[PDB]
Write an enzyme that holds these catalytic residues in place. Sequence first.
Site, mmCIF file in Angstrom:
data_model
loop_
_atom_site.group_PDB
_atom_site.id
_atom_site.type_symbol
_atom_site.label_atom_id
_atom_site.label_comp_id
_atom_site.label_asym_id
_atom_site.label_seq_id
_atom_site.Cartn_x
_atom_site.Cartn_y
_atom_site.Cartn_z
ATOM 1 N N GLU B 59 0.979 -1.256 0.190
ATOM 2 C CA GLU B 59 -0.041 0.103 -0.096
ATOM 3 C C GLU B 59 0.876 1.069 -0.006
ATOM 4 N N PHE B 121 -11.402 -6.481 14.780
ATOM 5 C CA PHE B 121 -10.410 -7.307 13.752
ATOM 6 C C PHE B 121 -10.054 -5.935 12.784
ATOM 7 N N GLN B 122 -8.882 -5.993 12.807
ATOM 8 C CA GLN B 122 -8.087 -4.968 11.690
ATOM 9 C C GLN B 122 -8.778 -3.521 11.846
ATOM 10 N N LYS B 171 -17.635 -0.607 6.351
ATOM 11 C CA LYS B 171 -17.997 -1.830 5.592
ATOM 12 C C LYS B 171 -19.415 -2.035 5.622
ATOM 13 N N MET B 485 23.962 9.566 1.414
ATOM 14 C CA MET B 485 23.865 10.853 1.802
ATOM 15 C C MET B 485 24.162 10.881 3.368
HETATM 16 C C1 LIG Z 1 18.128 15.149 0.910
HETATM 17 C C2 LIG Z 1 17.304 16.363 0.577
HETATM 18 C C3 LIG Z 1 18.107 17.845 0.375
HETATM 19 C C4 LIG Z 1 17.237 18.786 -0.148
HETATM 20 N N1 LIG Z 1 18.083 19.965 -0.198
HETATM 21 C C5 LIG Z 1 17.372 20.853 -0.891
HETATM 22 C C6 LIG Z 1 17.904 22.185 -1.699
HETATM 23 O O1 LIG Z 1 19.206 22.127 -1.545
HETATM 24 N N2 LIG Z 1 17.296 23.281 -2.048
HETATM 25 C C7 LIG Z 1 15.939 23.078 -2.258
HETATM 26 O O2 LIG Z 1 15.432 24.016 -2.986
HETATM 27 N N3 LIG Z 1 15.064 22.084 -1.749
HETATM 28 C C8 LIG Z 1 15.942 20.909 -0.986
HETATM 29 N N4 LIG Z 1 15.171 19.954 -0.444
HETATM 30 C C9 LIG Z 1 13.766 19.936 -0.379
HETATM 31 C C10 LIG Z 1 13.160 20.883 0.630
HETATM 32 O O3 LIG Z 1 13.073 20.193 1.682
HETATM 33 C C11 LIG Z 1 11.798 21.591 0.213
HETATM 34 O O4 LIG Z 1 11.305 20.610 -0.609
HETATM 35 C C12 LIG Z 1 12.279 22.771 -0.684
HETATM 36 O O5 LIG Z 1 13.271 23.364 -0.274
HETATM 37 C C13 LIG Z 1 10.926 23.745 -0.395
HETATM 38 O O6 LIG Z 1 10.154 23.394 -1.617
HETATM 39 P P1 LIG Z 1 9.309 24.842 -1.866
HETATM 40 O O7 LIG Z 1 9.856 26.180 -1.454
HETATM 41 O O8 LIG Z 1 9.228 25.081 -3.657
HETATM 42 O O9 LIG Z 1 7.935 24.918 -1.414
HETATM 43 P P2 LIG Z 1 6.781 23.645 -1.852
HETATM 44 O O10 LIG Z 1 6.710 22.586 -0.729
HETATM 45 O O11 LIG Z 1 7.004 23.220 -2.958
HETATM 46 O O12 LIG Z 1 5.244 24.525 -1.410
HETATM 47 C C14 LIG Z 1 4.591 25.205 -2.478
HETATM 48 C C15 LIG Z 1 4.530 26.527 -1.627
HETATM 49 O O13 LIG Z 1 4.229 27.453 -2.813
HETATM 50 C C16 LIG Z 1 2.624 27.738 -2.346
HETATM 51 N N5 LIG Z 1 1.678 27.445 -3.486
HETATM 52 C C17 LIG Z 1 1.402 26.271 -4.034
HETATM 53 N N6 LIG Z 1 0.427 26.479 -5.036
HETATM 54 C C18 LIG Z 1 0.499 27.671 -5.266
HETATM 55 C C19 LIG Z 1 -0.102 28.665 -6.385
HETATM 56 N N7 LIG Z 1 -0.868 28.024 -7.196
HETATM 57 N N8 LIG Z 1 0.005 30.085 -6.256
HETATM 58 C C20 LIG Z 1 0.718 30.297 -5.389
HETATM 59 N N9 LIG Z 1 1.368 29.990 -4.231
HETATM 60 C C21 LIG Z 1 1.141 28.475 -4.416
HETATM 61 C C22 LIG Z 1 2.233 26.670 -1.355
HETATM 62 O O14 LIG Z 1 1.453 27.496 -0.426
HETATM 63 C C23 LIG Z 1 3.706 26.387 -0.669
HETATM 64 O O15 LIG Z 1 3.838 27.603 0.520
HETATM 65 C C24 LIG Z 1 15.880 18.635 -0.127
HETATM 66 C C25 LIG Z 1 15.350 17.683 0.251
HETATM 67 C C26 LIG Z 1 15.910 16.498 0.566
HETATM 68 C C27 LIG Z 1 15.178 15.014 0.694
HETATM 69 C C1 LIG Z 2 -6.869 -13.804 9.008
HETATM 70 C C2 LIG Z 2 -7.185 -13.861 10.521
HETATM 71 C C3 LIG Z 2 -8.200 -14.670 11.123
HETATM 72 C C4 LIG Z 2 -8.173 -14.933 12.497
HETATM 73 N N1 LIG Z 2 -9.207 -15.756 13.106
HETATM 74 C C5 LIG Z 2 -9.123 -16.318 14.250
HETATM 75 C C6 LIG Z 2 -9.643 -17.442 14.921
HETATM 76 O O1 LIG Z 2 -10.481 -17.972 14.138
HETATM 77 N N2 LIG Z 2 -9.727 -17.778 16.137
HETATM 78 C C7 LIG Z 2 -8.730 -17.084 16.807
HETATM 79 O O2 LIG Z 2 -8.711 -17.343 17.959
HETATM 80 N N3 LIG Z 2 -7.928 -15.706 16.491
HETATM 81 C C8 LIG Z 2 -8.231 -15.516 15.234
HETATM 82 N N4 LIG Z 2 -7.647 -14.180 14.639
HETATM 83 C C9 LIG Z 2 -6.728 -13.526 15.489
HETATM 84 C C10 LIG Z 2 -7.790 -12.310 16.343
HETATM 85 O O3 LIG Z 2 -8.054 -11.297 15.472
HETATM 86 C C11 LIG Z 2 -7.342 -12.182 17.700
HETATM 87 O O4 LIG Z 2 -5.607 -11.912 17.600
HETATM 88 C C12 LIG Z 2 -7.703 -13.203 18.595
HETATM 89 O O5 LIG Z 2 -8.934 -13.727 18.431
HETATM 90 C C13 LIG Z 2 -7.544 -12.870 20.058
HETATM 91 O O6 LIG Z 2 -6.512 -13.256 20.859
HETATM 92 P P1 LIG Z 2 -6.455 -13.295 22.358
HETATM 93 O O7 LIG Z 2 -8.269 -13.567 22.824
HETATM 94 O O8 LIG Z 2 -5.868 -14.295 22.994
HETATM 95 O O9 LIG Z 2 -6.197 -11.849 23.121
HETATM 96 P P2 LIG Z 2 -4.877 -11.173 22.972
HETATM 97 O O10 LIG Z 2 -4.892 -10.208 21.700
HETATM 98 O O11 LIG Z 2 -3.648 -12.070 22.743
HETATM 99 O O12 LIG Z 2 -4.616 -10.170 24.393
HETATM 100 C C14 LIG Z 2 -4.326 -11.092 25.696
HETATM 101 C C15 LIG Z 2 -5.134 -10.798 26.524
HETATM 102 O O13 LIG Z 2 -5.190 -11.252 27.934
HETATM 103 C C16 LIG Z 2 -4.744 -10.414 28.737
HETATM 104 N N5 LIG Z 2 -3.641 -10.555 29.365
HETATM 105 C C17 LIG Z 2 -2.470 -10.276 28.779
HETATM 106 N N6 LIG Z 2 -1.393 -10.870 29.668
HETATM 107 C C18 LIG Z 2 -1.897 -11.433 30.717
HETATM 108 C C19 LIG Z 2 -1.454 -11.804 32.195
HETATM 109 N N7 LIG Z 2 -0.153 -12.012 32.200
HETATM 110 N N8 LIG Z 2 -2.232 -12.098 32.927
HETATM 111 C C20 LIG Z 2 -3.495 -12.045 32.711
HETATM 112 N N9 LIG Z 2 -3.999 -11.413 31.482
HETATM 113 C C21 LIG Z 2 -3.265 -11.069 30.447
HETATM 114 C C22 LIG Z 2 -4.697 -9.033 28.025
HETATM 115 O O14 LIG Z 2 -5.357 -8.013 28.887
HETATM 116 C C23 LIG Z 2 -5.556 -9.431 26.850
HETATM 117 O O15 LIG Z 2 -6.933 -8.975 27.191
HETATM 118 C C24 LIG Z 2 -7.564 -14.078 13.390
HETATM 119 C C25 LIG Z 2 -6.597 -13.167 12.806
HETATM 120 C C26 LIG Z 2 -6.513 -13.121 11.314
HETATM 121 C C27 LIG Z 2 -5.351 -12.037 10.779
#
Ligand SMILES: Cc1cc2nc3c(=O)[nH]c(=O)nc-3n(C[C@H](O)[C@H](O)[C@H](O)COP(=O)(O)OP(=O)(O)OC[C@H]3O[C@@H](n4cnc5c(N)ncnc54)[C@H](O)[C@@H]3O)c2cc1C
Ligand SMILES: Cc1cc2nc3c(=O)[nH]c(=O)nc-3n(C[C@H](O)[C@H](O)[C@H](O)COP(=O)(O)OP(=O)(O)OC[C@H]3O[C@@H](n4cnc5c(N)ncnc54)[C@H](O)[C@@H]3O)c2cc1C
Lengths: 582, 582
Positions: B59, B121-122, B171, B485
């Site tokens: 992602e 979950f998630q 969902k 760098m």
């Molecule tokens: C390793 C590393 C080194 C770097 N060293 C440098 C360096 O040496 N020199 C350098 O320049 N950068 C460097 N940077 C990048 C730096 O961190 C910034 O990205 C950059 O300096 C700032 O960009 P900017 O001033 O164009 O502002 P931006 O981040 O591009 O923002 C645009 C600005 O203009 C405004 N604006 C946007 N659209 C409009 C519009 N339609 N009309 C009017 N205003 C608008 C916005 O409000 C904003 O304030 C480096 C990055 C890294 C990762």
């Molecule tokens: C694709 C997928 C499918 C899943 N399907 C299942 C399934 O079918 N069955 C399943 O079981 N899980 C499943 N899960 C996992 C599920 O989401 C949870 O992780 C699980 O169900 C809950 O675990 P748990 O009840 O042991 O609690 P935990 O998350 O392990 O937490 C531990 C609990 O015990 C307590 N505790 C911790 N330490 C102590 C201690 N020392 N003394 C007393 N209490 C303590 C904590 O307060 C907490 O409440 C699935 C996960 C995925 C990703």
Amino acid sequence: TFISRFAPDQPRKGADILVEALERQGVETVFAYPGGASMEIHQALTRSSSIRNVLPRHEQGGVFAAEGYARSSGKPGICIATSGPGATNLVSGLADALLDSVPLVAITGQVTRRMIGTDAFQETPIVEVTRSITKHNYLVMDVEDIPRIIEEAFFLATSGRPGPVLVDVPKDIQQQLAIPNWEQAMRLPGYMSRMPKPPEDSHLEQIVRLISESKKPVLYVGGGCLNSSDELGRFVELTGIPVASTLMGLGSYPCDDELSLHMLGMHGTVYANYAVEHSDLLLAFGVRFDDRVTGKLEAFASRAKIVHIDIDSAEIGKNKTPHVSVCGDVKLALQGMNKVLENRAEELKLDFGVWRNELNVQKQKFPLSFKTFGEAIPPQYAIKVLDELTDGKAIISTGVGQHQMWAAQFYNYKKPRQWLSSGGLGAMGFGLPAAIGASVANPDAIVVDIDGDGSFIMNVQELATIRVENLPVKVLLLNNQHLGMVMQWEDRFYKANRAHTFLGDPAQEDEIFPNMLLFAAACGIPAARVTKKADLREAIQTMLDTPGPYLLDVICPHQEHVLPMIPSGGTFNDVITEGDGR
Amino acid sequence: TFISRFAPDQPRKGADILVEALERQGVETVFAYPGGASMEIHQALTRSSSIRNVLPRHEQGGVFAAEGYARSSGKPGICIATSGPGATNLVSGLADALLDSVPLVAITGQVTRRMIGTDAFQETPIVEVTRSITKHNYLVMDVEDIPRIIEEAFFLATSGRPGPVLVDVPKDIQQQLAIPNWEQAMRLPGYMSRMPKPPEDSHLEQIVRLISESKKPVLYVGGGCLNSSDELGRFVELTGIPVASTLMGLGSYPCDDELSLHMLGMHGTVYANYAVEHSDLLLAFGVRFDDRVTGKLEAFASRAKIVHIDIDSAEIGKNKTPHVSVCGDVKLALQGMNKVLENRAEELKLDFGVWRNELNVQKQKFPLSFKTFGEAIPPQYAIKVLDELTDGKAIISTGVGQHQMWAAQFYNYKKPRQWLSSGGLGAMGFGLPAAIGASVANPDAIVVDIDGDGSFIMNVQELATIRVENLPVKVLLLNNQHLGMVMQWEDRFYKANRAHTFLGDPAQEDEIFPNMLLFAAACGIPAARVTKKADLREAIQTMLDTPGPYLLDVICPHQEHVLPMIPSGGTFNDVITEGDGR
Ligand SMILES: Cc1cc2nc3c(=O)[nH]c(=O)nc-3n(C[C@H](O)[C@H](O)[C@H](O)COP(=O)(O)OP(=O)(O)OC[C@H]3O[C@@H](n4cnc5c(N)ncnc54)[C@H](O)[C@@H]3O)c2cc1C
Ligand SMILES: Cc1cc2nc3c(=O)[nH]c(=O)nc-3n(C[C@H](O)[C@H](O)[C@H](O)COP(=O)(O)OP(=O)(O)OC[C@H]3O[C@@H](n4cnc5c(N)ncnc54)[C@H](O)[C@@H]3O)c2cc1C
Ligand SMILES: CCOC(=O)c1ccccc1S(=O)(=O)NC(=O)Nc1nc(Cl)cc(OC)n1
Ligand SMILES: CCOC(=O)c1ccccc1S(=O)(=O)NC(=O)Nc1nc(Cl)cc(OC)n1
Ligand SMILES: C/C(NCc1cnc(C)nc1N)=C(/S)CCOP(=O)([O-])OP(=O)([O-])O
Ligand SMILES: C/C(NCc1cnc(C)nc1N)=C(/S)CCOP(=O)([O-])OP(=O)([O-])O
Ligand SMILES: [Mg+2]
Ligand SMILES: [Mg+2]
Ligand SMILES: [Mg+2]
Ligand SMILES: [Mg+2]
Ligand SMILES: [Mg+2]
């Protein structure tokens, strides 16, 4: 007695104070990726002889590695990243460690204090961003607060219900010289008063009372029992109650045992869900009553007296209202109940053989079944072979999806902290980096990543980390060319209409894509692909016997479905026991 | 007149309303990764004939691709992810699009409304997480709000100062049937009243007045001029003022022009920084006065009348207090000043040839220089060859690091939106996915990813996306086996003490690791490695002439340094003009 690399009266950089603060916490391994805002910390890490850094190739790989280090050891995992994009790459890991209650301490660099809020170069409010996905976080505003904040961070991440704690450190604080005060007192007055007390004998005896009065008791064991392996096993001897484990509690009670109901829940066994459905006493130890386990709450254990033991008072009665509750360490609660059950053994005369037979009948009638199609490798059988050839003693990390469930079903984990898998968040790309962290925590252990071709490729860059660090990480890749779990829900509820779930190349439709063997080849990892079921046993044996890293591309038919399956929000009477995508 | 796939009186799923809402916004391409909480949206995407989905392998690759789609077109980029780990994987891209002001609309799935807050979950509070790293976000609570929220999202992401807008969709809202009301009125009363007005003739004439009174004028052009290419060029003809561009404004005024001072700032040319240092009138058009450009604010243009035109009133006077300011669209401000300069041409008699010669002298005495060592390929020369063989008409995306600066220095961009690079956040792993999005936005264009071996591997999984989507993405990989760098700052300020900046294998120290050619081989991408400078021209020519994707592993000596370099917080008198790591 700790030995510093500096004199007690000698000023040193704040970064050197930070690293030494880790040394005093017993930290041996960190997963740090360098950047402009954290160079001082990385420089200070080289001066340390006791702290090893495992440099990942992506900060998400770094935090996931810290998770595997933690889940497979009980220690806290420590990852370090730079400001801005380095910090934001930790987000998925922080939320992951929070939902799974993994002890984790994340250190992020930050722009100098005077630059905060000015939209400075590589600045993001990581504290404001991560506040809702961490147990707690800090923003260090003075170099003298480093020894206290680091102590509070490790205390908060490990005590009570574990979780991730982030510590944001500005660059000027790392450079500023100071003489640290290691005798500082932690400013956690409310949290320590809220810490649960050892369980009273009053509550424990009422539980043992309900055990004798019950005739259909079921143990509901989750991630809270990962440190109560012996206490739970002793508790089962004195009661004989069957043990139904969650996805997080796998291994707490041996999966190969005759009293083990294996996993329960949406993809839990039919007999485990049957036991909870028809129980009168549900001993929920270390669980949080997830919807993946309960489904419809009103029908989950609808005729059972629910005893809930949890160290987090917020979880007691959140989703399911219990009869008896104990807010405290389940490890102590088991110790107290074991002495009661041991002394009053002949007085109670506990025997649930009638209830066990009612469940053992369900084991024979509805066991974990998989179908073999010709010579095509069924993934379930591939995992069962890995169980045999490793004697069930391997550390298993997985991605998320069908392969994750099959690794939970068809592997009999004998001890806790062998099973490393994203449960709550369910983050793909977790298995490979977690395997890295587990291997560094357990060098003499068999670490196998049962990954899926979708999850594996997400953090595939960590293959370079595995070679450079020379880690014996095995990758059992169950390749089905699909996002299998999402594909399964397409077959069941959307008439098999594929919506961007095919991971291969539509031009070469029957070609396995990508060629994962070349990914391992790029990082100098020996690899091999097995397609026919006959060659599967020798292929897996080669993976285990070959020293160092190894990738095994196990091709599987994609039409397989995870069974059984209770639909989301359903009851036990809605369980799907048969069917696939053919 | 829009043509729906549904009757005006026919109920349809909220997901189908969401997709049609995108269709009415003119969306042709989305970067969506499926998950449990967004399957309904993906199903609804297949029913659309006008919206194409580019399925990434991560992602973060999806959102970075949406950035490249946006920066290289002016359109808003649209990425879609599932809840939990899918959403958290967008975080780096959202913060990236915010700091660089990139129009972007991110749609995340979410658990059903009744499950929010229950640690389902998630589930992650992605709205609470991303509020500080987005322009605005939404949580859809009713299916009838979809047509309005999607319209507000695109309006907010594109109007004014562009930025990312996230829309969290539960969902149950996607499944709920409804008849959408497309004639809804947007609820943005305060934002629209705060929208800048067209610039008054009063302010514009005072600027032209200051231009005639000035003798050393310099144009300070940034990312705000990406849509004012013609207006700025016409403005330069009427004034003859030299143009110093920022990292974001590269291409607004042709880099190969005799009036172009090229890039200014920390790694800007010596003559560009000289012009601003010794100017009396600084025309800051579309800039935000970053510390990378100014360094020490008190010394930046210390003797210049500062005219600042910006569409964000928050930026005017934030870091540098101006004399004259214009809050509005710089495109309109240039149009108004061009008519004034054109009519009053003979009245003003503008000629800065004395000031231009003072700068052209600096061009000859302190130009962009690189050193060639034997047959080793200097990366600067490799980029200059890419400029020649592509005639400066290629779309260039980069990672972050030394290679990013060399791609900014040694390539003469003729038009804006040819240069795609993470400036504010500076996120590694940006170049490869951004190249994907740029190629889908500009199919008949030359898209080249000038990536670094550290940045390239972070999102290397997107090589699979390039093959599956059959995109002619060229990867000019400048491999120096180091985090260059960070390595450069180690040589300058830490006595060349390496702190985890070597990306190769210490066992095989002189072997190039990893073998990036095999990464391309795994995804069916033809690749090649060139080491000797003589073969460099033919190798790059092969990359361009070979149809489809191509990876070129260009090996470079790692001791190279980016020059010139003004240290952070320094002045013009602190510029480093010579030195490397040898
Ligand atoms: C390793 C590393 C080194 C770097 N060293 C440098 C360096 O040496 N020199 C350098 O320049 N950068 C460097 N940077 C990048 C730096 O961190 C910034 O990205 C950059 O300096 C700032 O960009 P900017 O001033 O164009 O502002 P931006 O981040 O591009 O923002 C645009 C600005 O203009 C405004 N604006 C946007 N659209 C409009 C519009 N339609 N009309 C009017 N205003 C608008 C916005 O409000 C904003 O304030 C480096 C990055 C890294 C990762
Ligand atoms: C694709 C997928 C499918 C899943 N399907 C299942 C399934 O079918 N069955 C399943 O079981 N899980 C499943 N899960 C996992 C599920 O989401 C949870 O992780 C699980 O169900 C809950 O675990 P748990 O009840 O042991 O609690 P935990 O998350 O392990 O937490 C531990 C609990 O015990 C307590 N505790 C911790 N330490 C102590 C201690 N020392 N003394 C007393 N209490 C303590 C904590 O307060 C907490 O409440 C699935 C996960 C995925 C990703
Ligand atoms: C990325 C680090 O960000 C900062 O710390 C920072 C930010 C804004 C202003 C000043 C600084 S600073 O003077 O306290 N430090 C730096 O700017 N360090 C830095 N390191 C690297 Cl390797 C590169 C870089 O700019 C390219 N800058
Ligand atoms: C991951 C989706 O999360 C949810 O939407 C969700 C969360 C908690 C409770 C109920 C639901 S639900 O009944 O509204 N929908 C699902 O649970 N969908 C779902 N999809 C997949 Cl592919 C897998 C899965 O559980 C393994 N669940
Ligand atoms: C896309 C998805 N879930 C949504 C999703 C998206 N992105 C992330 C990071 N995590 C999740 N859980 C799954 S479970 C597909 C799993 O595919 P796989 O890794 O090849 O495993 P398998 O095919 O056995 O299901
Ligand atoms: C680690 C780092 N910066 C910190 C960092 C960390 N992680 C991310 C995602 N982004 C950044 N900017 C850099 S610039 C190293 C660049 O290495 P490279 O990709 O091989 O490019 P080059 O070697 O030319 O500098
Ligand atoms: Mg309560
Ligand atoms: Mg798969
Ligand atoms: Mg102001
Ligand atoms: Mg990756
Ligand atoms: Mg590099």
